[PDB]
């Protein structure tokens, strides 16, 4: 089914403390796999998944160049946008760029995406047709026009539809064990007395991948108007993800309560109950 | 891989 190859680019201006910071990270699905950062003597693209640790110098030399090139263009763009907005050299500014291509279950291009953001708001967006843009303002309109005159959308569509997809395949293969051989949640329920008369049941879901997951509490196998705390899905550090969902319930009614866990790595949804 | 195509804004 749907896989994706995404890069996320960050350029931050550092007035008279060097040129701007540029960081680039590449994900397949929920798995970071490469990285570039211009804080070092040699800034080089580098692996950040064990399964890239065996890619040869042709890969790294090229992607190094590629990142460098983008960094340098992003310096230019930060200057340019300072201009369009008449801001001083003294201020620090952030330009961000996210792009990706997705596969369908057929193994083929499904959709592509590309967006720019100045100082944390949308600036310029590539439209779903990958043939045109959407500016948010006058400044962006100058950028729209420049891109139009340059057939940028064509060039990006070529990357997104073709090259992006070619390489997503290569990576999915190389990282099969991580990307395709999923990790179901290790799943359990803890009990935490609040007061004399009521407890928190908390349903854990640990070490799962990918990050998409659904935790649900049921009273007598049905919804409940009951306090339902749900924490943001969080990285364990090891490539997997964690999440819990708690409800507070009257002590001695913990058996009315069941946790429902849906995740792609399970063969089937699991239900769960506090075991004394 | 990275895009070989980088917009000039």
């Amino acid at each position: 089914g749907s896989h994706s190859l995404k890069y996320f680019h960050t350029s931050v201006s550092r007035p008279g403390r060097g040129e701007p910071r540029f960081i680039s990270v590449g994900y397949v699905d929920d798995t970071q796999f490469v990285r570039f950062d211009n804080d070092a003597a040699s800034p080089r693209m580098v692996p950040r998944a064990p399964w890239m640790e065996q890619e040869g110098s042709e890969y790294w030399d090229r992607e190094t160049r590629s990142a460098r090139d983008t960094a340098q263009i992003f310096r230019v763009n930060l200057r340019t946008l300072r201009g369009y907005y008449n801001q001083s050299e003294a201020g620090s500014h952030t330009l961000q760029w996210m792009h990706g291509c997705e596969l369908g279950p057929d193994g083929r291009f499904l959709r592509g995406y590309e967006q720019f953001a100045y100082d944390g708001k949308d600036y310029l967006t590539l439209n779903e047709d990958l043939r045109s843009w959407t500016a948010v303002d006058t400044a962006a309109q100058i950028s729209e026009q420049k891109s139009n005159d340059a057939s940028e959308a064509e060039h990006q569509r070529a990357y997104l539809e073709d090259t992006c997809v070619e390489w997503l395949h290569k990576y999915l293969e190389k990282g099969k064990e991580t990307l395709l051989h999923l990790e179901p949640p290790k799943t359990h329920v803890t009990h935490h007395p609040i007061s004399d008369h009521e407890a928190t049941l908390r349903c854990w879901a640990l070490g799962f991948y990918p990050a998409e997951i659904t935790l649900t509490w049921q009273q007598d196998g049905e919804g409940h108007t009951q306090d339902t705390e749900l924490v943001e899905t969080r990285p364990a550090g090891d490539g997997t993800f964690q999440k819990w969902a708690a409800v507070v319930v009257p002590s001695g009614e913990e058996q009315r309560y069941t946790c429902h866990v849906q995740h792609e790595g399970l063969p089937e949804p699991v239900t769960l109950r506090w075991k004394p | 891989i990275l895009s070989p195509f980088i917009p000039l804004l």
Epitope: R62, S66, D69, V76, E154, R157, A158, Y159 | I6
Partner: T-cell receptor, first 111, second 111 residues
Framework: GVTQTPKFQVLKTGQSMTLQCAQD?????MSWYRQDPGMGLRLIHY???????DQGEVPNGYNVSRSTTEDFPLRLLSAAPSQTSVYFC???????????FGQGTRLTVVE | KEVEQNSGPLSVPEGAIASLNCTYS??????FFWYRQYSGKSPELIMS????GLKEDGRFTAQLNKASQYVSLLIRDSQPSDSATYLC????????????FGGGTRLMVKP
């Protein structure tokens, strides 16, 4: 967009010479190709931006410098008959997009 | 030789379709160009293609097939103005040395 100079040039073996190139488009990338009659262009040297240069396919005999964005002169050190050729400067927005060339310099080096 | 064109020259009757081909060795090539050069003058960009497929502008059609590593140009209704050398250029992303040129094919439109 791209002003290259001069259009013609004769040189004595051993002389040195600097072809000029200037671009109003304010693009990062700039290049020097030579083209011998009947053949394709070959890349001599290029510059990714102000303050940088790289070698191309046939760098030998030639020096380049990129002080400004606007200009990118090519310098023949010690002219030889082999460097009798036509030289084109170009400007480019990205490394691998459209090369915009200049009018060209036709240059014969003679004993 | 990374970009192959046949020098020809090729003849086409005036009014007839001309067809010009180019192959290239590196699967890393991501951008493709047809340049027209009149004897004496600079290369001038006829057409640019990046996506696999067919692209049309006026009398010109270009076709790219990265699977088989060829790019081609078609000129409908050949005119004496179309007589020239035609240059194939690819942008190789594996090597990054700007645009890499084939040797060119000269087209003689005979009336």
């Amino acid at each position: 967009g791209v002003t290259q100079t001069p259009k013609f040039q004769v040189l004595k073996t051993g002389q040195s010479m600097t072809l000029q190139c200037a671009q109003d488009m304010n693009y990062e990338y700039m290049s020097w190709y030579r083209q011998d009659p009947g053949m394709g262009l070959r890349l001599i040297h290029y510059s990714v931006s102000a303050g940088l240069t790289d070698q191309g396919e046939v760098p030998n005999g030639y020096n380049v410098s990129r002080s400004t964005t606007e200009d990118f002169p090519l310098r023949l050190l010690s002219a030889a008959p082999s460097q009798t050729s036509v030289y084109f400067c170009a400007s480019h927005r990205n490394r691998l997009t459209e090369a915009f060339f200049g009018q060209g310099t036709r240059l014969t080096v003679v004993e | 030789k990374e970009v192959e064109q046949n020098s020809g020259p090729l003849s086409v009757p005036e009014g007839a379709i001309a067809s010009l081909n180019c192959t290239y060795s590196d699967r890393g090539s991501v951008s493709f160009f047809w340049y027209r050069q009149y004897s004496g003058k600079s290369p001038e960009l006829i057409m640019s293609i990046y996506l696999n497929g067919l692209k049309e502008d006026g009398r010109f059609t270009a076709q790219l097939n990265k699977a088989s590593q060829y790019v081609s140009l078609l000129i409908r209704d050949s005119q004496p103005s179309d007589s020239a050398t035609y240059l194939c250029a690819v942008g190789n992303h594996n090597t990054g040395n700007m645009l890499t040129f084939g040797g060119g094919t000269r087209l003689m439109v005979k009336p």
